């Protein structure tokens, strides 16, 4: 206490002191003992030296395993409450880390970005920035700044008596300087180049399909993917390849891993409010300028607030249907969206179901399945699909069809974030009339033309009849036509 | 108020008891008092509101049987193998209301963010270190903490 | 000159008003596929928002719900932006970043990551020499000391310790202690309600003397710092890097990894204050509504008050152990300082709402001290006889002296207006 440095005077027989593990008793050492977690605590110490048990020089205390004093090279690492081992590795979607000397060494890996428009008003950019503006126009979501290779537009329109009830009515995907325009409406209709088409479409540089009755997925060759949820309300999830980092710009940010500049307008400065930056991406002059107020819809109605609190708190309930996802996706933002949407919109159940489905889709994107989450609420969509369709919580594949059976190739993107909805049951193929039929009822196809059962076709002198969904050919087959020189 | 400090010798802020009833006051007066009753080790009697009040009791070898601390409404009772906080046994380390109680291989330490540190070692020594803001405002076996050994004690 | 165009006689390939732009629509690409009725300016003209039509290059620049003509000047951070043909021309001078810690563990890092952490121990707010531990410069370490403030599990700061070189500063209660061990590389200056510690390495600290700290770090320390204030590399997601040098998603783990003493118990998730203390909630919502009313209406376009309002309500709900007014005043003063930093001199302290006793500093038979919302950046004093102001600190509100012409130099040590020092 006087600022001195006493020297050890004890011994095995002269006032012996015992220490746990391999620690040694010293009269003057720093009380800030280095451990595996904090291996430089002694250097960052403000107290004077004290007497007690200390680790031998060259070793630090093992607080993770309580195995006495261990060398720095033998120190373990802790991640998510689970102790690792020297040399053990873990990986996230964006990084890969390895334990060494009690510290994590991390290497970056290629990582696609995700923008989200949920509830018609809640935006989450590629860099993770979140905001909420209730627009009344068509807005530029994502677009390269220096080119027009692709462009995504969202038609956010006021769909209620008040100015804070916004619906996403359509999504426009423009390709190659507006040479390929696909407009997907909230009613499920798809317009390719102003022509009402039928899914799936394999157009120039884009393929659009319907994995289920609830979702429409559009994948482009430029690294862009769109998931569009149509039941109960239209919500958008855009995924962008890492090759476009720092190049896009719109309502979804510039994809440069920085949240600060995500509110930067085309003028060149970063705005302070979400509404000011949001209003600069209008497409028409007549659209109103949205000013963000500080309303709290849940405070305007007792019953609405009670309903929203009762049914939206399941998102943050650790022991509920969504409890297996709190480690993957933080539910706070989804809980706030659920509360606001349920209290604000007239159809409270629809907005509650939309928020729950958005959280479930985020969890599925992270790789967590929450099947059986519709028990108690949102039961109605499970009992509304056509006669031959049945519901499924997990739809990670593509719908099999009679044309898929005949041709052998199904128009799909193969790999997409798993979705939910009503599909054809297993072993049953979707017929061209929107009906799920068995393999024995799927029609034959020759040269892209439907061949009804009992009919025959003539090809290279061979007669092939369509029986029981199979195109048998008399004479065995027609192996290979040969043309003489 | 800017207060400078350069001297690291701070023996004037430390009062302790050890061995055969040996006491050292904050002012450096070392004496012996073989009392086995309950005595006030140190308390903040210089203000209308008392920040701390530490009492110690001895039992017969001059062993320490009980240490009672009143720290800003927190009552800590330290006995051999037992730590009670507000009448409830606790598991160390224990942090509550700015008071941290932790046991080591050689001592039990109670640190109070108002500026006090108490050490009950395993050689039966009770050492108290006080912040300099409590100078000239204490009383008990540890003196009045004014830098002068005999006067006022 | 705008004419109403209707789609009654809509020839193919004619958008009408669907591709009519304005001074606010910064994207000039025509996206409408079909005709939309509405007002259309003459060919090659865009709307100016007041009914007229002007050329695209003549549209005024838009910034924070305001319009600026060509050649006008705005200030962002430290740079200057000039409007020119709808664009902003800004210099590229790097400057400081501010980490703000206030209230019941409300943190905002250098890179803009906002979070809430309630840790009971001492935590490394910022320090250099994290990776490699050599780098350059001299090692510095700003460490916060915390104490429970409430009964719901919230925790607020009590003392701030700055370890620079071989010197230590302890800002505690309302005083500063130079624990010490060359010359002192510190400059302590009381301006407004703030105590400013300036270092020669490029580190500034504003302390409201109760619970609020604002650490300003020069751009020379980018990527060379760590702690609860992030690592200062313009990325906010990776600011949750534990002491083991791994970015985690749990705020509790990241906060607990930065405690000074490994033996200190780890913090747990606190209860919801307005849920654990409902009987206070209304009062909170009635008191923090100042952040949404006409008092700060001019600032709503420049600083978003959502997180400040949330922190105010949570602190007022959790300030249940004594001192609700201090919690409320700190929460509102955080937003007030945020407004002042961007050049908005908003006055919010009334005799009923966080009063300041300026007249307490008036000597016998004198009246000089007055409340300043943005403060006096360059006020004449003994250490600044020429009346210079270095910027780098903006809007430090509080009581400032207005020395008369007879005695125009303010001596802080004597705390009086004198003719010469
Ligand atoms: Ca970015
Ligand atoms: Ca960072």
Q: What is the DSSP string of B27-81?
A: TS-EEE----SEEEEEE--SSSS-SEEEEEEEE---EEEEEEEEETTEEEEEETT
* Of A296, A305, A385, A317, the residue nearest A342 (C-alpha): A305
**In the Cβ-directed half-sphere of B145, how many Cα atoms lie within 13 Å?**
27
Q: How many residues does chain C have?
A: 421
CA distance C330 to chain B (A): 21
| The two structure tokens encoding residue A282 | 């209008």
Contact by Cβ (8 Å): A95, C246: no
Distance CA A354, CA A349 (A): 8
DSSP one-letter code for A282? B
Which of C31, C46, C168 is closest, CB to CB, to A138? C31
Q: What angle do CA A327, A333, A337 make, to 5 degrees?
A: 135
C-alpha C240 – ligand 2 centre gap (Å): 8
Q: Which of C26, C234, C301 has its CB closest to that of A273?
A: C301
Could you give the CA distance from residue C206 to residue C187 in angstroms, rounded to a whole number? 12
CA distances from A198 to A188, A231, B31 (A): 10, 19, 100
Q: Quote the CA–CA distance of C335 and C106 in Å, as a whole number.
A: 12
How far C359 CA lies from chain A's nearest CA (Å)?
A: 37
Of C38, C64, C236, the CB nearest to A259: C236
CA distance A411 to A207: 8
Encoded tokens for C328: 């409320």
Chain C residues within 8 A of B98 when measuring between CB atoms: 147-148, 158
Q: Mutate which of C12, C262, C272, C281 to disrupt the A interface (most A C-beta within 10 Å)? A: C262
Going by C-beta distance under 8 Å and a sequence separation of 6 or more, which residues neighbour residue B111? B99, B100, B102, B117, B118
Residues 6+ apart with CB under 8 A from B49: none
- Could you tell me where the DSSP H helices lie in A380-465? 402-407
Contacts of A52 in chain B (CB under 8 A): 104-107
At A299 the three-state DSSP class reads helix
CA-atom Rg of chain B in angstroms: 15
**Angle, to 10 degrees, between the axis of helix A302-312 and the axis of helix A332-344?**
150
CB-based contact C175 B2, cutoff 8 Å: yes
Element (H, E) at A362: helix A348-366
CB contact under 8 A, C247 and A106: yes
Cα separation, C145 vs C179, in Å, equals 16
A contact test, residue of B15, B106, B107 with most A CBs within 10 A:
B106
CA of A255 to the centre of ligand 1 (A): 5
Distance between CA B29 and CA B146 in Å, rounded?
Answer: 12
Instruction: Tell me the longest C-alpha to C-alpha distance in chain A.
Output: 113
**Nearest-CA distance from A336 to chain C in Å?**
13
Contacts of A20 (CB under 8 A, 6+ apart): A53, A68, B105
Instruction: Using CB atoms within 10 Å of the CB of residue A122, give its burial: 0 to 12 exposed, 13 to 18 middle, 19+ buried.
Output: buried
Sheet holding A103-108, edge to edge: A89-91, A95-100, A103-108
Cβ of C418 under 8 Å from any chain A Cβ?
no
Question: In this complex, do B105 and A23 lie within 8 Å of one another by their Cβ atoms?
Answer: yes
* C-alpha distance from B78 to closest chain A C-alpha (Å): 21
Q: Measured between alpha carbons, how far is C366 from C123 in angstroms, rounded to an integer?
A: 44
- Please choose, from the candidates C31, C73, C67, C28, the residue with its C-alpha nearest in 3D space to the C-alpha of residue C49: C67
Tokens of A272: 């302070």
Q: Using an 8 Å Cβ cutoff, are B77 and B66 in contact? A: yes
What's the CA angle centered on B98, arms C157 and B100, to 5 degrees?
125
Closest ligand, as measured to the CA of A127: 1
State the SS3 of A136-181: CEEEEEECECCCCCEEEEEEEEECCCCCCCEEEEEEEEEECCCCEE
Mutant choice from C167, C178, C195, C262 vs B, greatest count of B C-beta within 10 A: C178
- B104 and A52 within 8 Å at the Cβ level: the answer is yes
Beta strands in C61-113 (DSSP E): 61-62, 67-68, 73-76, 79-84, 87-90, 97-102, 106-108
**C113 alpha carbon, closest ligand:** 2
B12 CA: distance to closest CA in chain C (Å)? 16
Residues C38, A95: C-beta atoms closer than 8 Å: no
- How far CA C153 is from CA of C147, C271, C320, in Å, comes to 10, 7, 11
Contact with chain A for residue C346, Cβ under 8 A? no
Q: Is A90 helix (H, G, I), strand (E, B) or coil?
A: strand
Instruction: Looking at the CA of A260, name the nearest ligand.
Output: 1
CA distance C59 to C72: 13
To one decimal place, what's the resolution in Å?
3.9
C143 upstream amide cis, omega within 30 of 0: no
Asked whether the beta carbons of residue C264 and residue B95 sit closer than 8 angstroms, the reply is: yes
Q: Which residues does chain C break after (C to N > 2.5 Å)?
A: 181
- Residue for token digits 């020395």? C403
Taking an 8 Å cut-off on Cβ atoms, the answer to whether B11 and A53 are in contact is no
Closest ligand to Cα C236 = 2
Comparing alpha-carbon positions, the chain B residue that sits nearest to A46 is: B8
| A106 to chain C: closest CA residue | C246
Q: Quick check: C246 and A272 CB within 8 A?
A: no
Residue C345's nearest CA partner among C192, C188, C214 is C192
Cβ distance B97 to C148 less than 8 Å, yes or no, reads yes
Binding residues of A for Cu(2+) are 1, 48
Ligand located closest to A125 CA: 1
* Breaks (C–N over 2.5 Å) after residues, chain A: none
d(CA A291, CA A278) in angstroms, rounded, equals 10
Q: How far is B38 from chain A (nearest CA, A)?
A: 27
DSSP string, B119-144: EEETTS-EEEEE-GGGTT--BSTT--
Residues bordering ligand 1, an ion, CB closer than 5 Å: A 127, 256, 258
Report CA-CA distances (Å) from A278 to A273, A357, B35, B91, C398: 9, 25, 79, 54, 36
Kindly state the tokens that stand for A104. Answer: 């994590």
Asked whether C345 and C374 are in contact (CB, 8 A), the reply is: yes
CA neighbor of A164 nearest in space, from A124, A130, A135, A140: A135
Burial of A483 (0-12, 13-18, 19+ CB in 10 A): exposed
Rounded distance between C-alpha atoms, residue C271 and residue B122, angstroms: 39
User: From the centroid of its chain, how far is CA A187?
Assistant: 23
Question: Does the distance separating the beta carbons of B6 and C263 come in below 8 Å?
Answer: no
Rounded to 5°, angle at Cα C391 from C390 and C395: 140
Q: Which residues of chain C neighbour A37 with C-beta distances below 8 Å?
A: 243-244, 257, 262
User: How far does the CA of residue B52 sit from the closest CA of chain A (Å)?
Assistant: 22
| CB pair distance less than 8 Å for A1 and B11 | yes
Q: What is the per-residue burial (b if ≥16 Cβ within 10 Å, else e) of A70-88? A: beeebbbbbbeeeebeeee
The string of DSSP codes covering C140-205 is: EEEEEEEEE-SSSS-EEEEEEEEEETTEEEEEETTEEEE--------EEEEETTEEEEE-TTSEEE
CA C222 – ligand 2 centroid, Å = 9
Residue B89 CA from chain centroid, whole number: 21
Torsion over CA of B6, B11, B14 and B17, rounded to 10 degrees?
A: 170
């Amino acid at each position: 206490h006087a600022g001195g440095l006493p020297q050890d005077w004890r011994g095995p027989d002269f006032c012996p002191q015992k220490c746990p593990n391999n620690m040694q008793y010293h009269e003057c050492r720093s009380p800030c003992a280095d451990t595996c977690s904090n291996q430089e605590h002694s250097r960052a110490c403000e107290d004077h030296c004290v007497a007690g048990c200390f680790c031998p020089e060259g070793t630090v205390l093992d607080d993770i395993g309580q195995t006495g004093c261990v060398p720095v090279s033998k120190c373990a690492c802790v991640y998510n409450g689970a102790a690792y081992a020297p040399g053990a590795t873990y990986s996230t979607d964006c990084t890969n880390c390895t334990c060494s000397g009690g510290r994590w060494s991390c290497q970056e890996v290629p990582c696609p970005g995700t923008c989200s428009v949920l509830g018609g008003a809640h935006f989450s950019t590629f860099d993770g920035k979140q905001y909420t503006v209730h627009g009344d126009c068509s807005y530029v979501l994502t677009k390269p700044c220096d080119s027009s290779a692709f462009t995504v537009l969202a038609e956010l329109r006021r769909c209620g008596l008040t100015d804070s009830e916004t619906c996403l009515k359509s999504v426009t995907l423009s390709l190659d300087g507006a040479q390929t325009v696909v407009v997907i409406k909230a009613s499920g209709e798809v317009f390719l180049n102003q022509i009402y088409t039928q899914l799936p479409i394999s157009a120039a540089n884009v393929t659009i399909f319907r994995p289920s009755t609830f979702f429409i997925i559009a994948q482009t060759s430029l690294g862009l993917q769109l998931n569009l949820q149509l039941v109960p309300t239209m919500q958008l999830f855009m995924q962008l390849a890492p090759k476009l980092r720092g190049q896009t710009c719109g309502l979804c940010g510039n994809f440069n891993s920085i949240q600060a500049d995500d509110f930067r307008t085309l003028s060149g400065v970063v705005e302070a409010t979400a509404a000011a930056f949001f209003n600069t991406f209008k497409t028409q002059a007549a659209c109103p300028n949205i000013r963000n107020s500080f309303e709290d819809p849940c405070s305007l109605s007792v019953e609405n607030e009670k309903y929203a609190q009762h049914w939206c708190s399941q998102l943050t309930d650790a022991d509920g249907p969504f409890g297996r996802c709190h480690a993957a996706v933080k539910p706070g933002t989804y809980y706030s969206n659920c509360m606001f949407d349920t209290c604000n919109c007239e159809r409270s159940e629809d907005c509650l179901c939309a928020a729950l489905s958005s959280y479930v889709h985020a969890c599925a994107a992270k790789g967590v399945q929450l099947g059986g989450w519709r028990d108690g609420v949102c039961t109605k969509p499970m009992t509304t699909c056509p006669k031959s369709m049945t519901y499924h919580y997990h739809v990670s594949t593509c719908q099999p069809t009679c044309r898929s059976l005949s041709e052998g190739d199904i128009t799909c993107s193969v790999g997409f974030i798993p979705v939910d909805g009503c599909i054809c049951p297993k072993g049953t193929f979707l017929d061209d009339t929107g009906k799920c039929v068995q393999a024995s009822n799927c029609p034959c196809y020759h040269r892209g033309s439907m061949i009804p059962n009992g009919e025959s076709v003539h090809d290279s002198g061979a007669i092939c009849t369509c029986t029981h969904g199979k195109l048998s050919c008399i004479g065995g087959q027609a192996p290979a036509p040969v043309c003489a020189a | 108020p800017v207060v400078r400090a350069s001297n690291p010798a701070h023996n004037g802020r430390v009062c302790s008891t050890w061995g055969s009833f040996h006491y050292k006051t904050f002012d450096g007066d070392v004496f012996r008092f073989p009392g086995l009753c309950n005595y006030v080790f140190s308390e903040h009697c210089g203000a209308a509101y008392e920040d701390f009040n530490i009492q110690l009791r001895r039992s017969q070898a001059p062993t320490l049987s009980r240490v009672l601390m009143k720290v800003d409404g927190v009552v800590i009772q330290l006995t051999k193998g037992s730590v009670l906080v507000n009448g409830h046994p606790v598991l160390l380390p224990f942090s509550q209301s700015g008071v941290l109680i932790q046991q080591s291989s050689s001592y039990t330490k109670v640190e109070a963010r108002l500026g006090l540190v108490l050490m009950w070692n395993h050689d039966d020594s009770l050492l108290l270190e006080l912040d300099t803001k409590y100078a000239n405002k204490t009383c008990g076996l540890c003196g009045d903490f004014n830098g002068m050994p005999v006067v006022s004690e | 000159p705008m004419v109403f165009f209707d789609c009654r006689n809509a020839t193919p390939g004619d958008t009408g008003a669907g591709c009519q732009k304005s001074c606010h629509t910064l994207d000039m690409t025509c996206y409408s596929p079909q005709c939309v009725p509405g007002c259309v300016c003459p060919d090659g003209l865009v709307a100016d928002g007041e009914g007229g039509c002007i050329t695209a290059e003549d549209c005024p620049c838009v910034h924070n719900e305001a319009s600026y003509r060509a050649g006008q000047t705005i200030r962002v951070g430290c740079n200057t932006c000039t409007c020119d043909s709808r664009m902003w021309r800004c210099t590229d001078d790097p400057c400081l970043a501010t980490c703000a810690v206030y209230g019941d563990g409300h943190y905002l890092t250098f890179d803009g990551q906002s979070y809430s952490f309630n840790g009971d121990c001492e935590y490394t707010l910022v320090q250099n020499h994290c990776g490699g531990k050599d780098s350059t410069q001299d090692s510095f370490r700003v460490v916060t000391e915390n104490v429970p403030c409430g009964t719901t599990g919230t925790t607020c700061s009590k003392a701030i310790k700055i370890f620079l070189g071989g010197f230590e500063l302890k800002l505690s209660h309302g005083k500063v202690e130079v624990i010490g061990t060359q010359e002192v590389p510190y400059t302590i200056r009381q301006m407004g309600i703030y105590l400013v510690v300036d270092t020669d390495i490029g580190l500034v600290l504003l302390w409201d003397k109760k619970t609020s700290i604002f650490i300003n770090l020069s751009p020379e320390f980018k990527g060379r710092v760590c702690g609860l204030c992030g690592n200062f590399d313009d990325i906010a997601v990776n600011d949750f890097a534990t002491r083991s040098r791994s970015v985690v998603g749990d705020v509790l783990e990241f906060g607990n990894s930065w405690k000074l003493s490994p033996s200190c118990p780890d913090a747990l998730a606190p209860k919801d204050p307005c849920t654990a203390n409902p009987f206070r909630k209304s009062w909170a919502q009635k008191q923090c509504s100042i952040l949404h009313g006409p008092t700060f209406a001019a600032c709503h376009a420049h600083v978003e008050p959502a997180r400040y309002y949330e922190a105010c309500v949570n602190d007022a709900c959790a300030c249940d152990s004594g001192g609700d007014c201090e919690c409320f005043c700190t929460a509102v003063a955080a937003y007030a300082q945020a407004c002042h930093e961007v050049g908005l001199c908003v006055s919010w302290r009334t005799p009923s709402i966080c009063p300041l006793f300026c007249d307490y500093y008036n000597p016998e038979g004198q009246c000089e001290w007055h409340y300043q919302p943005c403060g006096v950046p360059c006020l004449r004093t003994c250490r600044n006889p020429r009346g210079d102001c270095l910027r780098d600190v903006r809007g430090l509100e509080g009581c400032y002296p207005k020395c008369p012409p007879e005695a125009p130099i303010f001596d802080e040590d004597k705390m009086q207006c004198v003719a010469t020092c």
